[PDB]
Design an enzyme around this catalytic site. Structure first.
Site, short mmCIF file in Angstrom:
data_model
loop_
_atom_site.label_atom_id
_atom_site.label_comp_id
_atom_site.label_asym_id
_atom_site.label_seq_id
_atom_site.Cartn_x
_atom_site.Cartn_y
_atom_site.Cartn_z
N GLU A 77 0.82 -1.20 0.00
CA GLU A 77 0.00 0.00 0.00
C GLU A 77 0.85 1.25 0.00
OE1 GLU A 77 -0.45 2.42 2.49
OE2 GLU A 77 -1.84 3.51 1.21
N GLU A 150 9.29 3.50 1.04
CA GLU A 150 8.23 3.28 2.01
C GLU A 150 8.45 2.05 2.86
OE1 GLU A 150 7.19 3.45 -1.36
OE2 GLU A 150 7.23 5.64 -1.32
N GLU A 175 6.92 3.30 11.84
CA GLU A 175 5.50 3.18 12.15
C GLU A 175 5.21 1.89 12.91
OE1 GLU A 175 2.64 2.14 8.69
OE2 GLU A 175 1.90 4.02 9.56
#
Length: 966
Positions: A77, A150, A175
């Protein structure tokens, strides 16, 4: 026109753009008709909701089956939002964030499915974003450098020096470090891992920081080619925009390129266990409380049957709600006042995120020696419920709560719909079936009235008779994250050692090209766009009428189509209260409707409120003046809800609360204070940005001062100090002192929103209430560190600007959105590596800098200095001022519910006049005014500064004497 009326004309078998009308069914209680269609050639499944609400919403769904704890789908994603074939421009996503009048805009990756939602009010923009995400999901340019960006990648501290060490970086890495920063999330995720250890449910879909570096580009691309086929695609739409256009765009744009395949993504069922197991795991310490032994959490979890048989799953959810909700629920009665823990465990009650539902229950903060005590209590209470069951009034209270959930009208309603339907529709459920809520209640009442012992026997089957029981005990480890750092450095050294010198040169070169990518200003001129000319000039006026009654208390009535719902709010100033008692006032806000009233004990008043109301809450607010820094308004808002028919009784409860609440139950008082202390202690990570904003502004504004007193870390600290006190009676002497100044009508105003047909009766009830109530600076710079045991950071910088009514306010608003979009977004997120950090300006005119989970600290301060320098440079284009105007309009024109519109007048006294003038001023925003205001306030030496930090230790900050350590 209407949405349902046109949607009803759809006939079965209609061939439309390669799809066939498969079912259309009206759900009148939600005031819409659902229609689901399928692609004829590929078989793609599609769902639409047509309802007469302007805020249309789109999202799509893929069934995502990881087989490892690398986090491949979640990073997938994060990559496919950064570039595709048809719009190869760099990072389409955060640019289109500056392009929209959207209402909600992000995407989630759940445990077994991935969802791409958005919602907006402009149809052509909707078509644009439709194209953008279909192309981004289906044809993404999968550059290895984005794979590095990412996900996971190794770079020197300075991408220009190949001599400094290579370390693990990527947004996902930080994260997931943050996601496992929270002990509650640790417990949850570990719970899913343990209960279903057979298949993909056994892995951590979000990604274990210890497993991510194992992903290669080839694996990611293989995953994407494997899972993102249209035959595995779920399309879901809700809103009023014409449907056939959606069909036209999707068919002629995306589906034409692929051919049918069959996803090998069926999830097998967990094999039934025959016997319980027990496990003991370690987690992180507490922030920052006492008793290192009284920190133990325990739980028992239970396997539930497959959720595709919707009715029984709904039944079991209601049973869980009976079992755990409210201080009159059984396990509450056994556990809470047992003095054994501090409150219910995480994940209480029914939790249906995975395929196979589980029940959970437990406590926090016990001594570990009592785990057997807890589980024995569990078994005994279960058996007692088996033998006697539940009182019927709690049944009706639950049914009334579910009914209120059914009619309440949200500002993000579509997101609610999709989140509640996602799992079932993912696992080959029939998505219309969860929508038949009234049907559910009908058979629920039928099944209760046919069997007095249905509920007890259901408890028997699914708790006493399931051998698939699991009991988990969880204790914190003070060196847990030290262990994580150890193993991380261990994996790091093995991965660097295996790198060849040529490989190391490729790594360094690619880091060089990466910050080149991050540095070059690039074009998005292939992207469609709006202009300021495309915003409607005016707002529809909000109708008010002020009726002075008994004899000077203003009451507002707003006729609205709320579907039989009554909305009451009330606000009392605090000007007479002696200031020493202010810090305990927030508790008075939190519990005053939770202590018992008159002839009703705590259990009876709770039963009545939950049977008649929808929730009765109080939270203090400080309302600043719009034109003066040293004038502001402080007070408490009581808020409630009921259906029309039950209003008089609720307001009666309000009256008996206002005159005779029960302030003598100090035991259950101590329980409530210690438990709310627990949630404030365990909620710290998720709103650190707001806590820092609040702390930094304490010495800057009187409104800031009182907000800090009311809602900051000072408040939670005071609360914890209170929650450890053994003798509460001096505090109990404080409550009547507050009561005698708070609940009367001496300085009072009230607000009401109601349906037009109802106002006359409401007026009688409210006048009964009102007759039933009594009728007797220098800013100074601070730098502050909270020593926090965290792997991430939270920084706050605040600069004192001027309030709403000065015309430069529009300028500063555009400046702040500009800075976030074009300097801080770039640096702080992609260069810095933090997931969230930016700047906002509040309605109070306080201009705030915030950071949310940043691995870096001083580079942040340098980034803000360079950000204000860049703003003062003027080195930015007129198209960006266009787009920042567009985003600010995207915020201030946010859809307002029937329930809220317009509370801001009743609160702040801001009419349509001032806001419409501000909107015209936003139309008129110019370059020279922006540069002038930036020179006037953001330049050095012009304004007073305020600084704060929450996070792990920093020696450099520690050796700064101009910093205060807290």
């Amino acid at each position: 026109a209407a949405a349902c009326e046109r949607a009803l004309q759809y006939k079965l078998g209609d061939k439309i753009h390669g799809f066939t009308v498969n079912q259309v069914t009206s759900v009148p209680e939600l005031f819409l008709t659902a229609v689901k269609l399928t692609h004829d050639d590929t078989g793609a499944r599609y769902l639409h909701l047509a309802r007469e609400d302007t805020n249309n919403l789109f999202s799509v769904q893929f069934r995502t089956t990881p087989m490892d704890s690398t986090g491949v789908p979640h990073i997938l994603e994060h990559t496919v939002l950064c570039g595709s074939q048809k719009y190869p421009c760099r990072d389409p996503f955060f640019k289109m964030l500056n392009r929209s009048l959207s209402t909600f805009m992000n995407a989630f990756t759940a445990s077994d499915y991935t969802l791409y939602p958005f919602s907006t009010q402009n149809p052509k923009d909707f078509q644009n974003l439709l194209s953008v995400y279909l192309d981004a999901t289906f044809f993404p340019c999968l550059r290895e450098l984005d794979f590095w960006q990412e996900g996971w990648r190794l770079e020197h501290e300075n991408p220009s020096d190949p001599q400094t060490p290579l370390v693990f970086k990527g947004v996902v890495f930080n994260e997931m470090k943050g996601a496992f920063t929270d002990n509650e999330r640790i417990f949850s995720q570990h719970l899913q891992n343990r209960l279903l250890p057979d298949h993909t449910y056994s892995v951590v879909s979000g990604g274990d920081p210890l497993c991510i570096p194992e992903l290669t580009w080839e694996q990611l691309k293989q995953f994407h080619a494997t899972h993102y086929h249209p035959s595995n695609a779920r399309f879901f739409t809700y809103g009023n925009f014409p449907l056939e256009q959606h069909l036209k765009q999707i068919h002629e744009e995306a589906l034409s390129k692929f051919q049918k395949i069959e996803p090998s993504t069926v999830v097998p069922a967990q094999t039934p266990w025959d016997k319980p197991r027990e496990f003991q795991i370690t987690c992180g310490p507490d922030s920052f409380a006492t008793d290192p032994s009284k920190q133990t959490t325990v739980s028992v979890s239970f396997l539930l049957p497959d959720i595709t048989d919707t009715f029984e799953a709904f039944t079991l959810s209601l049973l869980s709600s009976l079992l755990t909700s409210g201080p009159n629920s059984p396990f509450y009665k056994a556990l809470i006042e047992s003095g054994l823990g501090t409150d219910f465990s995480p994940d209480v009650g029914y939790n249906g995120y995975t395929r196979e539902a589980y029940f959970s229950v437990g406590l926090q903060g016990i001594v570990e020696k009592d785990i057997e005590t807890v589980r024995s209590l569990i078994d005994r209470t279960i058996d007692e419920v088996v033998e006697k069951g539940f009182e019927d009034d709690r049944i009706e209270a639950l049914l009334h709560k579910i009914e209120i959930q059914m009619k309440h009208q949200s500002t993000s309603f579509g997101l609610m719909l999709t989140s509640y339907i996602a799992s079932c529709w993912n696992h080959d459920g029939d998505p219309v079936e969860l929508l038949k809520l009234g049907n559910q209640l009908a058979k629920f009442r039928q099944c209760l009235q046919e069997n007095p012992k249905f509920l007890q026997e259901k408890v028997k089957q699914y708790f006493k008779n399931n051998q698939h029981k699991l009991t988990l005990s969880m204790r914190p480890d003070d060196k847990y994250h030290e262990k994580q750092a150890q193993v991380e450095a261990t994996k790091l050294k093995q991965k660097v050692e295996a790198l060849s010198p040529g490989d190391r040169q490729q790594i360094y070169e690619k880091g060089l090209e990466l910050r080149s990518q991050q540095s070059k200003p690039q074009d998005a001129s292939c992207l469609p766009a709006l202009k300021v000319s495309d915003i409607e000039p005016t707002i529809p006026v909000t109708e008010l009428d002020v009726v002075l009654t008994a004899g000077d208390i203003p009451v507002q009535y707003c006729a609205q189509p709320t579907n039989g719902m009554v909305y009451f709010r009330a606000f009392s100033s605090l000007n007479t209260l002696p200031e020493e008692l202010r810090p305990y006032v927030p508790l008075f806000c939190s519990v005053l409707t939770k202590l018992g009233c008159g002839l009703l004990d705590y259990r009876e008043q709770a039963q009545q409120i939950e049977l008649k109301t929808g929730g009765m809450s109080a939270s203090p607010h400080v309302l600043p003046d719009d034109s003066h820094m040293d004038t502001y308004e402080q007070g408490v808002l009581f808020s409630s809800l009921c259906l029309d028919r039950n209003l008089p009784d609720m307001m009666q409860l309000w009256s008996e609360i206002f005159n005779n609440p029960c302030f003598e139950e100090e035991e259950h008082f101590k329980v409530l204070v210690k438990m709310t202390a627990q949630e404030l202690a365990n909620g710290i990570p998720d709103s650190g940005h707001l806590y820092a904003s609040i702390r930094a502004g304490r010495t800057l504004t009187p409104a800031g001062d009182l907000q800090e007193t009311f809602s900051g870390m000072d408040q939670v600290r005071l609360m914890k100090r209170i929650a450890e006190m053994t003798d509460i009676k001096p505090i109990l002497r404080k409550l009547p002192r507050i009561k005698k100044h708070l609940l009367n009508g001496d300085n009072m105003r009230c607000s009401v929103n109601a349906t037009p047909q109802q106002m006359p009766q409401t007026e009688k009830a409210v006048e009964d209430f009102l007759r039933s109530i009594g009728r007797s600076f220098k800013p100074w710079q601070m730098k502050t560190h909270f020593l926090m045991p965290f792997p991430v950071n939270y920084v706050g910088e605040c600069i004192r600007t001027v309030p709403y009514t000065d015309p430069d306010h529009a300028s500063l608003k555009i400046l702040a959105r500009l800075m976030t979009a074009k300097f801080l977004h770039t640096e702080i997120r992609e260069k810095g590596g933090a997931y969230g950090g930016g700047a906002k300006l509040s309605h109070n005119g306080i201009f705030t800098l915030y950071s949310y989970r940043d691995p870096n600290t001083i580079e942040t301060l340098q980034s803000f200095g360079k950000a204000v320098d860049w703003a003062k440079s003027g080195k930015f284009t007129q198209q960006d001022i266009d787009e920042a105007k567009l985003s600010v309009f995207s915020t201030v024109d946010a859809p307002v519910a029937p329930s809220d519109k317009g509370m801001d007048h009743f609160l702040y006294g801001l009419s349509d006049e001032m806001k419409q003038a501000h909107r015209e001023q936003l139309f008129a925003v110019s370059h020279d005014k922006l540069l002038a205001v930036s020179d006037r306030y953001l330049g050095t030496g012009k304004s007073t500064h305020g600084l704060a930090i929450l996070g792990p230790e920093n020696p450099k900050i520690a050796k700064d004497p101009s910093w205060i350590i807290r």
